[PDB]
Subunit: 198 residues, 4 copies
């Protein structure tokens, strides 16, 4: 059974960058629903699979990708943030960012560009391309997860669904992007990067 | 030059169903941006068309559908609402709804179902199918407009992008759907229906 | 385990409308590959689901929909055709057609148009909408199956992938559509209709 | 007005790798139809844009991308091939390849895989990412053009629509891919590369 992970910090720990109301709803309501809905969807698919009902399996795909991706995405997202986040990464991760994007600041502009560019709901990602052996930026629609749909290993995700910023930044998504850099947990992003170090 | 239409009522005229803050931002900020961005996009396409630059024309499609659809959708939406809305339609429109959906209440449940079912950003629509000569319910993603992408003539649209309800109803989209029925301008929906009366 | 069904007739039974080379290749190579790949994909999904590996489940969706859809679609297609087919249907089906499309000829026009309209690979379908309780024509891309993706019940499908007609009709898909009417198994289409209209 | 370019060689010049019947049909019928439909669609767009008819502009997008993309893609494809082609490229291009893909053979493996991987109709491409300043392989569905939809610059395209190989290789797309390497115009691919790498 999939389960809702606890936040690594309190709901108001990312203030004033992301306020407590957004965090509380985002975790206890939005993420929570994806987990429960994912479990329900998985149970329906085992039944469909057991009966060899291909039509049912296909009909369940949107729910599985949506709720499953929702669980995958938010689980990573919480770990990507920290009250003591911000600044820049060091060592290998930093060198890779410099190598692949020119400089840390350029990288921030490129991931900001990808995140602000999402039309409708979605996510901006810094991922790792195993085949090419380098970092790569990508944007995903709705809850479509990065690895499941592109093969890239997620390192840092920026949720740009309106439920992630509208209460506080209203329609000005760039203000939200501006603020989130202050709470990025580069320690976690570095750990995920080193995890694909092969 | 496309322009931002004035609202047919004040920003707080739909209270308590849709609060003033949502309306003020939705119209003066969200719709406004689509109009300006649409004008910019159209100007780029005339240049691309004049030079016969097919690649540029294709690259501009997402911006044109997104901002153009945004303008089309919101323009219709404002006219679909009224402080003195609610209740049920009469005459032909009502008979068609009964004929095509069984009853007015069933119709409300079906359009509610379509609207709540949108994964991510989008719209729920009651449209008119000219070929079949009957009403039809459809859901559209992001700002993809009803007529431009399905051929159905829009009669009533329900915006389910989070910027349309999150500030007030948070993650509970069904509460928003529950409330909006109280401000539907059936007089306008009837006018649009009679407009395809041929 | 899914299996390749035998054709209900000889590979050259549909001559001269659909030649024997196309039929033999379509059944013994094309459909067979979808069956094989479906079995492979389904088993990978069994493992992924057992491990609660959401990323793997999602990554397998394109292969499951494509190959699963391929199996569903071609299985129905073989039964929709017959060496003694052609002409028009009778009874309730014919009544539904004239009623929902005006006449049999207008119906041919609509389904032909939907099939010829597919850009790229896909299928044209005459289906049954259990919700509205009436017939409905739809087009599906690649191997996306009718019921699994639209909820409509398949009654008659027209495969417009190039492998279904290139060898014989070359780029003239309209000639292929005109010819296929001569081999439609209306008896089978009637069964499928009476089956969901109980 | 867009025009159908003459082929840079005889229809049977690529024998036995791609037969003359496929070449003649592909150029004189398939590509020709895209050109004709593109001109028709572009003119309708001129009218729609002049009237500020956003709905019509949006409704025309599928036809413009499909036919416009068709023209762009096939125009490049003819130049990427040659009767005296085959072998490997030299100089900077070859350096970029081994560098970005490991070796020429690994590159063939990657592009072949991308091309054979297309489910339904589409293209496999070796492109140039001006942003990262390196080569990049991508697959595009139907006639969606490489630059217009991904921003990457096309260097070499492999058409994997069934009309490009069914007549000769039947359902065995891998045999088609193996054969096409013998006619790649590396001289042309080099030009396109040096052109965007200025
Ligand atoms: Mn979220
Ligand atoms: Mn809106
Ligand atoms: Mn087929
Ligand atoms: Mn082609």
């Amino acid at each position: 059974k999939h389960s809702l992970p606890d936040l690594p910090y309190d709901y108001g720990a990312l203030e004033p960058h992301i306020n407590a109301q957004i965090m509380q709803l985002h975790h206890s309501k939005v993420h929570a629903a994806y987990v429960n809905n994912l479990n329900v969807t998985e149970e329906k698919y085992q039944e469909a699979l057991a009966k060899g009902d291909v039509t049912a399996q296909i009909a369940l795909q949107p729910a599985l990708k949506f709720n499953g991706g929702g669980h995958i995405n938010h689980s990573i997202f919480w770990t990507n943030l920290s009250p003591n986040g911000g600044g820049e990464p060091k060592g290998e991760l930093l060198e890779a960012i410099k190598r692949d994007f020119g400089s840390f600041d350029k990288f921030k502009e490129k991931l900001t560009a990808a995140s602000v560019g999402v039309q409708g709901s979605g996510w901006g990602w810094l991922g790792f391309n195993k085949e090419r052996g380098h970092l790569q930026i990508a944007a995903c629609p709705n809850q479509d997860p990065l690895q499941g749909t592109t093969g890239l290993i997620p390192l840092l995700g920026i949720d740009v669904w309106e439920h992630a910023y509208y209460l506080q930044y209203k329609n000005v998504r760039p203000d939200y992007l501006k603020a989130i850099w202050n709470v990025i947990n580069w320690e976690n992003v570095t750990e995920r990067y080193m995890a694909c170090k092969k």
